[PDB]
Amino acid sequence: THSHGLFKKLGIPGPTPLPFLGNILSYHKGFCMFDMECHKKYGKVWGFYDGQQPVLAITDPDMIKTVLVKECYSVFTNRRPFGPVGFMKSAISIAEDEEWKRLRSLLSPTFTSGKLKEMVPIIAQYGDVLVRNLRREAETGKPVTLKDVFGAYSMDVITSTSFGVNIDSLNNPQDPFVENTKPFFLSITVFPFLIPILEVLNICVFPREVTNFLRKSVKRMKEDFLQLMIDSHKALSDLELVAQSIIFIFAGYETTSSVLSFIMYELATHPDVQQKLQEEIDAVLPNKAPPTYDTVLQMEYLDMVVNETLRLFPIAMRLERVCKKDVEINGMFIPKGVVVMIPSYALHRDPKYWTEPEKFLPERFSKKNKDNIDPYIYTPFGSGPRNCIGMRFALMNMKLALIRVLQNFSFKPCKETQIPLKLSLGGLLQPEKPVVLKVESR
């Protein structure tokens, strides 16, 4: 408990922690409800304990910019430790300090405007596979699971954008890594001292059978992101090369299909926005013209729909940085070892910044009203040197999928559609019941 007197000493308010457990019993309603409740109880700053780990939550936009941007390289360089990872310690999202800096610098030129412009005529293929597979499940009066057909699409994109492997994600044969994307973490906070125990037993969060399903696949491409790695600080090792491919597969698959599912739920439960977005798509792309890089960046209402959905459902929920040494940001002492946390979900739904924050209103992001939005309150991709490096790629992939789908189909709520949607009362930001909707062909 000796560390549970930290916030009491610093005069920082917060819920009283129980011995050993801290405040983790409050996660029984999920991180999000616990964050919004503390935001209401304690105000701009509060602390709690993930077991013995003190966590200081900050909501001041200036203080948030200081942590994420101004003092990132010096004090707030790394995220909360995560284990056991095995060789995934060399992953960019996990790597720390100097190893992270080397990985970030040599992986940043992967998501430039030029590299993304090269991937657009390639992603267009699986948009048609997405429509034709949707055409089958839609031509029959059978409600459709979005994250299934969206997940099949998201799989198709990430294998080719970074490597070159092309598969219709209903081939169902030799190289689906569904084994890769296939509660013990509750003990990570109670037993973070057991991370060193498990890191010597080869225990990873995914088994060694999967992380060799692709480890060999990388070597056969001695014969895109895979290319750019062997093309390029000390050069990329062959195993580091492997670890970043894994990070991109998780990111490009789980985030894409999940956000697209939240988007289509919003359009179905708001028929006006769906019709308005369908009008804009028909105007920029008449005769169902194929979307391109520049035409995707021309659709303003499409971007307003995407941003507003990301406000309601920020899949990260929280942004975190480890305070690597004593600091005093914006007039507040922060001792070493404290985990600094930014409650993105809570700030995205704060009534003090958003009128009717529970309502889905894309007009918040109109160029008339977008200016009234603080970039350090709305942070769906983070901020600063450790923001989402695949942000521009993620937006481009999702919009290309929406354009081609809304060009051919309309979406209505079915009898089994969960309205209003329940968020997963568990850890990662997902819905409780999967999203199902009726699909009609235009």
Ligand X SMILES: CC(C)(C)OC(=O)N[C@H](CS[C@H](Cc1ccccc1)C(=O)NCCc1ccncc1)Cc1ccccc1
If the CB atoms of residues 296 and 389 are measured against ligand X, the closer one turns out to be 389
> 102 burial class (0-12, 13-18, 19+ CB within 10 angstroms)?
middle
- Contacts of residue 200, defined as CB under 8 A and 6 or more positions apart, other chains included, come to none
Q: Which SS3 state, helix, strand or coil, does residue 302 take?
A: helix
102 binds ligand HEM, rule: CB under 6 A: no
Contacts with its own copies, 307-346, as mask; x by CB under 8 A: ------------------xx--------------------
How many Cβ atoms sit within 10 Å of the Cβ of residue 221?
14
Strand duo 144-145 + 436-441: pairing:
antiparallel
Distance CA(72)–CA(319), nearest Å, equals: 13
Q: Is 414 annotated as a binding residue?
A: no
Q: Is residue 256 a contact point for ligand X (CB under 6 A)?
A: no
Q: What are phi and psi of 50, to 5 degrees?
A: -80, 85
228 makes contact, choosing from ligand X, ligand HEM, its own copies, none, with CB < 5 to 8 Å by partner type, with none
Q: Which one of ligand X, ligand HEM, its own copies, none interacts with residue 392, CB within 5 to 8 A by kind?
A: none
Q: Is 255 in the site for ligand X (CB under 6 A)?
A: yes
16's tokens: 């009283």
User: Rule CB under 6 A: is residue 115 a binding residue for ligand HEM?
Assistant: no
Are the CB atoms for 344 and 317 separated by under 8 Å?
yes
Choice from 23, 26, 52, 397 touching its own copies (CB under 8 A): 52
Q: Which stretch binds its own copies (CB under 8 A): 159-167, 196-204, 235-243, 307-315?
A: 196-204
Site mask for ligand HEM (CB under 6 A), range 159-198, x = bound: ----------------------------------------
Number of residues lying near ligand X (CB under 6 A): 16
For the chain, the farthest-separated pair of C-alpha atoms sits apart, in whole angstroms, at 68
What does the per-residue mask of binding to ligand X show for 340-379, with x meaning CB under 6 A? ----------------------------------------
Q: Which is nearer to ligand HEM, 137 or 303 (CB)?
A: 303
Q: Per rule CB under 6 A, is residue 403 in the interface with ligand X?
A: no
The correct pick among 27, 42, 82, 213 for binding ligand X (CB under 6 A) is 82
| Percentages of the chain per state (helix, strand, coil), in multiples of 5 | 50, 10, 40
Question: For residue 256, which of 431, 384, 440, 402 has the smallest C-alpha distance?
Answer: 402
Is 377 a residue that touches ligand HEM (CB under 6 A)?
no
Our CA dihedral for 395, 426, 194, 2, rounded to 10 degrees, sits at: 110
Selection from ligand X, its own copies, ligand HEM, none that 88 binds (CB < 5 to 8 A by kind) is ligand X
Nearer to ligand X, 190 or 251 (CB): 251
Contact yes or no for 194/187 (Cβ under 8 A): yes
Interaction between residue 364 and ligand HEM (CB under 6 A): no
376 CB-side CA count, 13 A: 14
Contacts of 145 (CB under 8 A, 6+ apart): 434, 435, 436
Residue 427 contact, options its own copies, ligand X, ligand HEM, none, Cβ 5-8 Å cut-off depending on partner type: none
SS3 340: strand
Peptide bond into 271 cis (omega under 30): no
CA 303 from centroid of its chain's CA atoms: 17
Q: Which of residues 389-408 bind ligand HEM (CB under 6 A)?
A: 389-390, 393-394
Q: Binding marks (x or -) toward ligand HEM, 142..161, rule CB under 6 A?
A: --------------------
Is 247 near ligand HEM (CB under 6 A)?
Answer: yes
Q: Which residues bind ligand HEM (CB under 6 A)?
A: 68, 92-93, 104, 247-248, 251-252, 255, 259, 315-316, 319, 380-383, 386-390, 393-394
Q: Which residues bind ligand X (CB under 6 A)?
A: 79-80, 82, 85, 88, 91, 93-94, 205, 247, 250-251, 255, 316, 320, 388
